[model samples]
Target: PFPPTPPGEEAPVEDLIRFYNDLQQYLNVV
Candidate 1:
């Protein structure tokens, strides 16, 4: 269940601010 582009990068793109947001959170935390 990990992969599969939980963000939407593999599938496609349209409105994906949360995915990037998740990245930012990761960057901020770790």
Candidate 2:
């Protein structure tokens, strides 16, 4: 599980990880 958003803003934390994952994917492709 991503432990996806417990409470609060419920965004950036999840978004950040997703963004990082994407960044890595791009990095790999590049």
Candidate 3:
């Protein structure tokens, strides 16, 4: 399961985009 965000808070769209970008880079390295 994914980790939970804090109550009454959410990550910004930019953060999510950055996360996916970083994830793709990591996968490419593997």
Candidate 4:
């Protein structure tokens, strides 16, 4: 199971930026 999205959709750029940033942060952490 996964978390659900909020009521509204995220902007394409915002989603991309978040994904990229999260991946980078995860790599840096490990």
Candidate 5:
């Protein structure tokens, strides 16, 4: 599972976007 963000906090937009794109690539590879 993806790592949890800080408790009660939100992740940055740039990080979220990058993670979203990376997840797509990871799914395809797997």
Candidate 6:
């Protein structure tokens, strides 16, 4: 799940991508 975009906050693309990749890795293993 993604966090809400806070006011004046930069998009955390890097964090999201890393989390997505980690999630995918576990999903693939399962």
Q: Give the poorly placed runs of model 2, Cα more than 4 Å off.
A: 1-10
lDDT of each: 0.55, 0.60, 0.58, 0.56, 0.61, 0.58
lDDT of 1 by residue, 1-30 (tens): 222235545655643666676666676677
lDDT of 3 by residue, 1-30 (tens): 223232333766777666677667666766
List clashing residue pairs in candidate 5: none
- Each prediction's total of clashing residue pairs, residues at least 3 apart in sequence or on different chains, is 0, 0, 0, 0, 0, 0
lDDT (10s digit) by residue, model 2, range 1-30: 232333346666777777677667666767
User: Highest lDDT among the candidates is held by which one?
Assistant: 5
Candidate 6 lDDT over residue span 1-30, tens digit each: 433332333656676676677777666666
Model 4 spans with C-alpha error above 4 angstroms = 1-11
**For candidate 5, what is the total of clashing residue pairs?**
0
Error of 1 at 5 (Å): 5.9
lDDT of 1 at 13: 65
TM-score of 4: 0.45
Report the CA-based lDDT of candidate 6 relative to the real structure: 0.58
TM-scores of all predicted structures: 0.43, 0.53, 0.55, 0.45, 0.52, 0.46
> Which ranges of candidate 5 are over 4 A from the true structure?
1-11
Tell me model 1's lDDT, rounded to 2 decimals: 0.55
Ranking by TM-score: 3, 2, 5, 6, 4, 1
Per-model C-alpha RMSD: 4.8, 7.1, 5.5, 5.4, 4.1, 6.1
Model 4 lDDT tens row, 1-30? 223232335456677666666667666766
Model 4 vs truth, CA RMSD: 5.4
